[PDB]
């Protein structure tokens, strides 16, 4: 609100009639005023969303100017999209050997490359997580309960 009011009156010469809400600007001046207001809107949207106004496309700019809300998908919704769609450019770059059985009930050792049941569970006990957990451990040292 505050910056928009200053934009609407570029100079003290520009005045509003008592019966007109908006300033009396010529047709050409309104172009510059609208450009300035659009720059205001885009800059504040970027500030609130930590994005650059240069990369926004024309449709995105129109959505920002209008009330259309480009809401970030939730963590649940992000997982749904991964499951709903086939793996992107799935590359079977990793082969895993497991002890399984065939269709005739014979124990067999098979090497498989399909990227299913291959997600890694990073637990709180896994040393990889605990290594960075123990990093910067002096934070707990400054505050003690002696």
């Amino acid at each position: 609100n505050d910056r928009a009011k200053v934009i609407l009156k570029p100079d003290k010469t520009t005045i509003t009639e008592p019966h007109h809400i908006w300033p009396t600007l010529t047709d050409e001046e309104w172009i510059k005023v609208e450009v300035q207001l659009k720059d205001l809107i885009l800059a504040d949207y970027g500030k609130k969303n930590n994005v650059n106004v240069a990369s926004l496309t024309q449709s995105e700019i129109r959505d920002i100017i209008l009330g259309m809300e480009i809401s970030a998908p939730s963590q649940q919704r992000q997982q749904i999209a991964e499951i709903e769609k086939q793996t992107k450019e799935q590359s079977q770059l990793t082969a895993t050997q497991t002890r399984t059985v065939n269709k005739h009930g014979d124990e067999i050792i098979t090497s498989t490359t399909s990227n299913y049941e291959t997600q890694t569970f990073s637990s709180k006990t896994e040393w990889r997580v605990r290594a960075i957990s123990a990093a910067n451990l002096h934070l707990r040292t400054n505050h003690i309960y002696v």
Binding site: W30, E34, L66
Partner: protein, 76 residues
Amino acid sequence: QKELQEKVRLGLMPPPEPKVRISNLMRVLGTEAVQDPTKVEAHVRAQMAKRQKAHEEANAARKLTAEQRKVKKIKK
């Protein structure tokens, strides 16, 4: 029409821009009209005025001079 299309395809003529009116403003450039309403309005009105000016220039260019009107009348 075929000659104009051949000129456009050959590159000798720029492709024709869509004809835009006041009622056609949003349907042609709604994305551009939202960001810059007055600028798009000015562009549309400039195109319409260019078309009207071309029409008037064609009509007036081919107009019987006042003395030439008499010459045709003085002869018939």
